[PDB]
Design a protein around this ligand. Sequence first.
Ligand SMILES: *[C@@H]1O[C@H](CO)[C@@H](O[C@@H]2O[C@H](CO)[C@@H](O)[C@H](O)[C@H]2NC(C)=O)[C@H](O)[C@H]1NC(C)=O
Ligand SMILES: *[C@@H]1O[C@H](CO)[C@@H](O)[C@H](O)[C@H]1NC(C)=O
Lengths: 58, 161, 108
Amino acid sequence: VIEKMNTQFTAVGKEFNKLERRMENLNKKVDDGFLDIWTYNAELLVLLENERTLDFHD
Amino acid sequence: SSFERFEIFPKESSWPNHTVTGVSASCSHNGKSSFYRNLLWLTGKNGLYPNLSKSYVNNKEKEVLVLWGVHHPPNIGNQRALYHTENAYVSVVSSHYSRRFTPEIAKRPKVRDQEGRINYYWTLLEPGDTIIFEANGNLIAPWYAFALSRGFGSGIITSNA
Amino acid sequence: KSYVNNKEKEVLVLWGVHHPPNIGNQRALYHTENAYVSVVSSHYSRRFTPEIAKRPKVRDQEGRINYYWTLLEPGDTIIFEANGNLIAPWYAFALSRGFGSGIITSNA
Ligand SMILES: *[C@@H]1O[C@H](CO)[C@@H](O[C@@H]2O[C@H](CO)[C@@H](O)[C@H](O)[C@H]2NC(C)=O)[C@H](O)[C@H]1NC(C)=O
Ligand SMILES: *[C@@H]1O[C@H](CO)[C@@H](O)[C@H](O)[C@H]1NC(C)=O
């Protein structure tokens, strides 16, 4: 679970101007999209692994 | 990875035919009117503001970040006091860059204690290329420039830690 | 003209610039050919000039009006200047923005 995560050096934040609001909102859309995907998958993955782990031990 | 701040256009030898002095109260330092260290405000000398022409060759194996600005007086009297032509422009070109700028003189709401404005512009000069600067007024000249060697992108973080 | 934003709201200010199809039209409405308008605020600056040209007709017009706008923050000021071709702001909107939502197209 840990090793398959691809960790790369990154630069997450981006700056936008007053008239670049659509770009800012797309940048936000991208962050929220990725965040909801990773959050949903991380929560769900852990719950599924926990059910299997407890069943594994039983 | 490397940020060399070098003097691109040495003050004393680069501009002997005009004024390389002049400060603003708005940039005051320790009570004295002042200005930026990497930029030089150019004004006329003894009534003259000659056409300027400068050329920098990038002889380093680095990109060079060149900064400059354009003065935008609040009025005509200010432009005439500093520059002696109303139809002022500056021009900056390189093998793959070209911009022409003119002042926009207007009354503006004050910011700090100023009515006029200075716009800031920049370009990255690739190794082996050249930047040619021209002006007949309103030039804030590059004085220092940075020879850059860029690393893997990282970021600007805001924190008081 | 100078408008001071004395409301605790952003003010949306609209204006436009007239772009005559020809010289006779510009002279008929404005009495200078070297017309410009200028709009500034503490953090805004634009200068505009007319572009006079014959254009294909749209509706029944040969000329055009461009529309421009800015959001004025509380406490700031917009200074407008012109010597011709100004479509002046008359009304403006004092805004208080909510969480972003959207423009939806539907005949429902
Ligand atoms: C550097 O930052 C300081 C802090 O904001 C500036 O000091 C303020 O200057 C304004 C006038 O422009 C005064 O009304 C404030 O009272 C000052 N603040 C303090 C805490 O003394 C300073 O002017 C800035 N200097 C430069 C060169 O940008
Ligand atoms: C300064 O002006 C003189 C003419 O008075 C000219 O010969 C000289 O080349 C100029 N120097 C520079 C750096 O422009």
